[PDB]
A paper describes a structure:
Myosin motor proteins are responsible for movement and force generation across multiple scales of biology ranging from muscle contraction to cell migration to intracellular transport. In this study, we focus on the MD of myosin VI, an unconventional myosin motor unique in its ability to walk ‘backwards’ towards [name] filament pointed ends. Here we present cryo-EM reconstructions of myosin VI bound to F-[name] in the rigor state at 4.6 Å resolution and the ADP state at 5.5 Å resolution along with corresponding atomistic models. Finally, by comparing the conformation of [name] in the myosin VI-bound ADP and rigor state structures to bare filaments, we find that [name] structural deformations accompany motor conformational changes during the force-generation cycle.
To monitor global rearrangements of the MD between nucleotide states, we used low-pass filtered density maps and MDFF to extend our models for the ADP and rigor state actomyosin complexes to include the converter and lever arm regions. We observe a ~ 30° rotation of the converter around an axis nearly parallel to the [name] filament upon the transition from ADP to rigor. Based on these grafted models, bending produces a 30° reorientation of the lever arm, which protrudes off the filament axis in the ADP state but is almost perfectly parallel to the filament in the rigor state, providing a new explanation for early EM observations. Our models suggest that nucleotide release is coupled to a converter rotation that licenses a lever arm bend in myosin VI, contributing to the displacement observed in previous structural and functional studies of the ADP to rigor transition.
Author numbering:
A (entry chain T): 3 to 147
B (entry chain N): 2 to 398, 405 to 622, 636 to 817
The structure:
């Protein structure tokens, strides 16, 4: 299961899944977020895990169903490998650092609207060591907090 | 606040706009906005706060900044000229009859548009309730009920037909049961529907048309059940009222080859018709078709009754067309007229006092030929019927005959008419249910339709049982509303909170409690050797001397009620206010005396159709208990099912299109229990707005940086910036919830100093960058955890 502080951070992330604001998502909505962030599932497989969690019979994923849709008992190092795989979606050139240009590409693909001055403002707060780029150590202190 | 508009009590419109220019301890000096210089006085409880933008309407009434009955009345005034007749108040649908057919709303393309769509996201319509009730049947694993109230002409017939249309189109694949109720509607317009002081065509029974669903989700059958009937109306009526409509439509529509077989005569002759109104409903064309011998002196003097739809001569034809369609032949149709005519020739039998010989009563000599023409309609012997209407048969084990008193024989003769017609209406309903037998039973979606809170200037015993039935339904109404709100707060993640509930159990205990209740004293008065109505009235204020739900008539502000003497009536406060009832004839209308000597004679009839109607201890039985016992068989059935409350509004007295009367609509908001439920919701969070609603309202007042954000983060940043109190303002899952008057307080914070607001947005700018980082970081970790779920699941395949 998930902790209360882990549910709170996924609750704000669910607004990027549910952009319409009705509190519930379909396969037209949960498909378009996966494909916008580089992952292409097949419709049959994402239907099968919807038919696990949805008890309503309607095929529409609300927030408590979305929580049990990504939950599973995993081992200790499996967890750390998921955080590292997330870092690698932000890093486009694969150098182990996230620049302003690389952070801007994830923002625009998720639909966040922001200026070039705001992108430089974001990187600057996340950076701790003063190089102006976010290494894995600085990425986890921003995530965690 | 000062300067802010409030609603003002205007007699012709209910409420209008207005301002407060002076004030006192109990009163407010109200100056109208449109009529300046008219400056009247109004009390603290008669004024209500109004919203800043009054030119806008809302589909959902929880989106109002001030939720009250004056802003609800203005919401259904604006929606009436936009032709939006359906209005969403939580789990309550408010439907207003327009008396005209609106385009495309009843369309089959519209029906399949609503199908399976989420709730609240589609415009309000009656098909959005029927689709919800199918989904909160199969998912819930429980049966459902649609509750339809309102007065006649409010669209309660038409709303029922749209429910049965949606179930045999959207989910039922075949089964043509929907219009078999509609096709045999004139049978229930004759047998069950009567005429009351404020309604020309009123249903006087609890119609429970149920639709059976199997486990495979198909319509397997329907069934029509009936509850309640006005036992008194059968034999004695009020001023200007009628009996049931089959006792006028058979008189008006009968031919002379039928009149010779039933021995029918004009209504003036018959005691169960001459007490009230004898006039027929008709139009100019059918007034020419009514025969001279069917006309009463009152008909000659005052003519036909005017109604745009009712025709007692022509609807008897459309009744006999419907008996041919449903399943009745002409011989069986004639046997449903022999029982009705036998009731008419029973009421003219009188009873004098016996000549000292053995005590008791005897029949009058003027009632001799009247008994001969009645006993062949009942299939009994005239010498055995005379004994049975005068004696109490018992045994000493020989079998003796002990005569009854004169008043007990008048009550026993009318008890036979309140037993034969009671089992005749139960035979009509059972015959109709045998014209469409259900295949099987499992789950069910039914429609309960009954008359609303109906009352007149002087109220009778018939209206006492209607308002007592609506008080018990008002208890279950508020019980279902509180349960919906408690599982809304949990669903939005707000959790449990304290809310105050209003009780009406003290009004129920007043009317029906054992030994001390009003119906319990009434049934005891029948047992006394000399019943009285002055002793009944004084006994009510004997046992209930205190309480607020009951006062003397002279305590009333109304002059008409102040003319009633202390022993002639009482005032009982109900959910719809203080209703006076007179006590004259109350005990007489309650008293029924069907005893062994007569109950075991009508069952023993030589006629076969009569024995089919009827399928020591207790003597006089318990008459005031049958009204409580039959109602408890429906209230616990309503507690065992889900509920879908559809309140029906009549907009004007004439019943004509495009007319709004706010002195008649507001009286139905306070007589529907709607205002009571809005009082309940002030205890909770009555005002709630989605994130997309608050984004469209307040983005223009915000800085361009904050405006760029998505609706949920826009509202989250705005709530954090302002620093709002946690017990007054609550951040939900799809909506922001507010305490009373705090959505209004919120709207004034946004309209206050732009520089101050800009500085508070500057102070939350670090948190907002950190929130916008964690939003895209935990969303990318969400896609990776759903990638790890697809692999984990496919590892066990």
């Amino acid at each position: 299961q998930l902790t209360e502080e882990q549910i709170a951070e996924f609750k704000e992330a669910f607004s990027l899944f549910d952009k319409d604001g009705d509190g519930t998502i379909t396969t037209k909505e949960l498909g378009t977020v996966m494909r916008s962030l580089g992952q292409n599932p097949t419709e049959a497989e994402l239907q099968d895990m919807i038919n696990e969690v949805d008890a309503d019979g309607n095929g529409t994923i609300d927030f408590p169903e979305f929580l049990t849709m990504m939950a599973r008992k995993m081992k200790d190092t499996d967890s750390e490998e998921e955080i590292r795989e997330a870092f690698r979606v932000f890093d486009k050139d694969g150098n182990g650092y996230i620049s302003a240009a690389e952070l801007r590409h994830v923002m625009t693909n998720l639909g966040e609207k922001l200026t070039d001055e705001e992108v430089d403002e974001m990187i600057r707060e996340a950076d701790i060591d003063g190089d102006g780029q976010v290494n894995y150590e600085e990425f986890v202190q921003m995530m965690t907090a | 606040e000062d300067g802010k508009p409030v609603w003002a009590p205007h007699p012709t419109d209910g409420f209008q706009v207005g301002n407060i220019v002076d004030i006192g301890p109990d009163s407010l000096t109200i100056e109208p906005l449109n009529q300046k210089g008219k400056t009247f006085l109004a009390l603290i409880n008669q004024v209500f706060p109004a919203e800043e933008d009054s030119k806008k309407d809302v589909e959902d009434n929880c989106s109002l900044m001030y939720l009250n009955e004056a802003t609800l009345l203005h919401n259904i005034k604006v929606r009436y000229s936009k032709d939006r007749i359906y209005t969403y108040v939580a789990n309550i649908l408010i439907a207003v009859n327009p008396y005209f057919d609106i385009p495309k709303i009843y369309s089959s393309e519209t029906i399949k548009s609503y199908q399976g769509k989420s709730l609240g996201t589609m415009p309000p319509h009656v098909f959005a309730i029927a689709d919800k009730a199918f989904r909160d049947m199969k998912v819930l694993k429980l049966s459902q009920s649609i509750i339809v109230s309102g007065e006649s002409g409010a669209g309660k017939t038409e709303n029922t037909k749209f429910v049965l249309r949606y179930l045999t189109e959207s989910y039922g694949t075949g089964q043509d049961i929907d219009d078999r109720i509609v096709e045999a509607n004139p049978l229930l317009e004759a047998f069950g529907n009567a005429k009351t002081v404020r309604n020309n065509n009123s249903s006087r029974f609890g119609k429970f048309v149920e639709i059976h669903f199997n486990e495979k989700s198909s319509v397997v059958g329907g069934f029509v059940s009936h509850y309640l009937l006005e036992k008194s109306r059968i034999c004695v009526q009020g001023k200007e009222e009628r009996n049931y409509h089959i006792f006028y439509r058979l008189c008006a529509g009968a031919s002379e080859d039928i009149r010779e077989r039933l021995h029918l005569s004009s209504p003036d002759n018959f005691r169960y018709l001459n007490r009230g109104c004898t006039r027929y409903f008709a139009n100019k064309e059918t007034d020419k078709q009514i025969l001279q011998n069917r006309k009463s002196p009152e008909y000659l003097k005052a003519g036909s009754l005017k109604d745009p739809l009712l025709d007692d001569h022509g609807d008897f034809i459309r009744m006999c067309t419907a008996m041919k369609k449903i399943g009745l032949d002409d011989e069986e149709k004639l046997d449903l007229f022999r029982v009705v005519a036998g009731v008419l020739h029973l009421g003219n039998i009188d009873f004098e006092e016996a000549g000292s010989t053995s005590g008791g009563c005897n029949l009058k000599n003027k009632s001799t030929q009247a008994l001969e023409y009645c006993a062949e309609l009942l299939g009994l012997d005239q010498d055995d019927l005379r004994v049975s209407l005068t004696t109490r048969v018992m045994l000493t084990t020989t079998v003796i005959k002990v005569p009854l008193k004169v008043e007990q024989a008048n009550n026993a003769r009318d008890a036979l008419a309140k037993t034969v017609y009671s089992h005749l209406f139960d035979h009509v309903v059972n015959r109709v249910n045998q014209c469409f037998p259900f295949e099987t039973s499992s789950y069910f979606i039914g429609v309960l339709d009954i008359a609303g809170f109906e009352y007149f200037e002087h109220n009778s015993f018939e209206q006492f049982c209607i308002n007592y039935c609506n008080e018990k339904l008002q208890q279950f109404f508020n019980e279902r509303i509180l349960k919906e709100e408690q599982e809304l707060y949990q669903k939005e993640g707000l959790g449990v909170n304290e809310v105050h509930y209003v009780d009406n159990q003290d009004c129920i205990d007043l009317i029906e409690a054992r030994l001390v209740g009003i119906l319990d004293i009434l049934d005891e008065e029948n047992r006394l050797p000399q019943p009285s109505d002055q002793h009944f009235t004084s006994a009510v204020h004997q046992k209930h001397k205190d309480h607020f739900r009951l006062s003397i008539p002279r305590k009333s502000k109304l002059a008409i009620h102040r003319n009633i003497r202390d022993d002639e009536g009482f005032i009982i406060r109900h959910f719809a206010g203080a209703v006076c009832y007179e006590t004259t004839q109350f005990v007489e209308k309650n008293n029924d005396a069907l005893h062994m000597s007569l109950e075991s004679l009508i069952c023993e009839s030589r006629d076969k159709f009569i024995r089919e109607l009827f399928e020591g201890k207790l003597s006089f039985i318990s008459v005031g208990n049958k009204f409580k016992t039959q109602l408890n068989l429906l209230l616990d059935k309503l507690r065992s099912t889900g509920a879908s409350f559809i309140r029906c509004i009549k907009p004007n007295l004439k019943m004509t299109s495009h007319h709004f009367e706010g002195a008649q609509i507001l009286s139905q908001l306070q007589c529907s229990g709607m205002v009571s439920v809005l009082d309940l919701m002030q205890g909770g969070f009555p005002s709630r707005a989605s994130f997309h609603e608050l984004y469209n309202m307040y983005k223009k007042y915000m800085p361009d940086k904050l405006a760029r954000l998505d609706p949920r983060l826009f509202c989250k940043a705005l709530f954090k910036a302002l620093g709002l109190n946690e017990i007054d303002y609550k951040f939900g899952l799809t909506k922001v919830f507010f305490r009373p008057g705090k959505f209004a307080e919120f709207d004034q914070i946004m309209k206050s100093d732009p520089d101050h607001l800009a500085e508070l947005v500057k102070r939350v700018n670090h948190w907002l960058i950190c929130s916008r980082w964690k939003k895209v970081q935990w969303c990318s970790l969400s896609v990776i955890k759903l990638k790890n779920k697809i692999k984990y699941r496919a590892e066990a395949c």
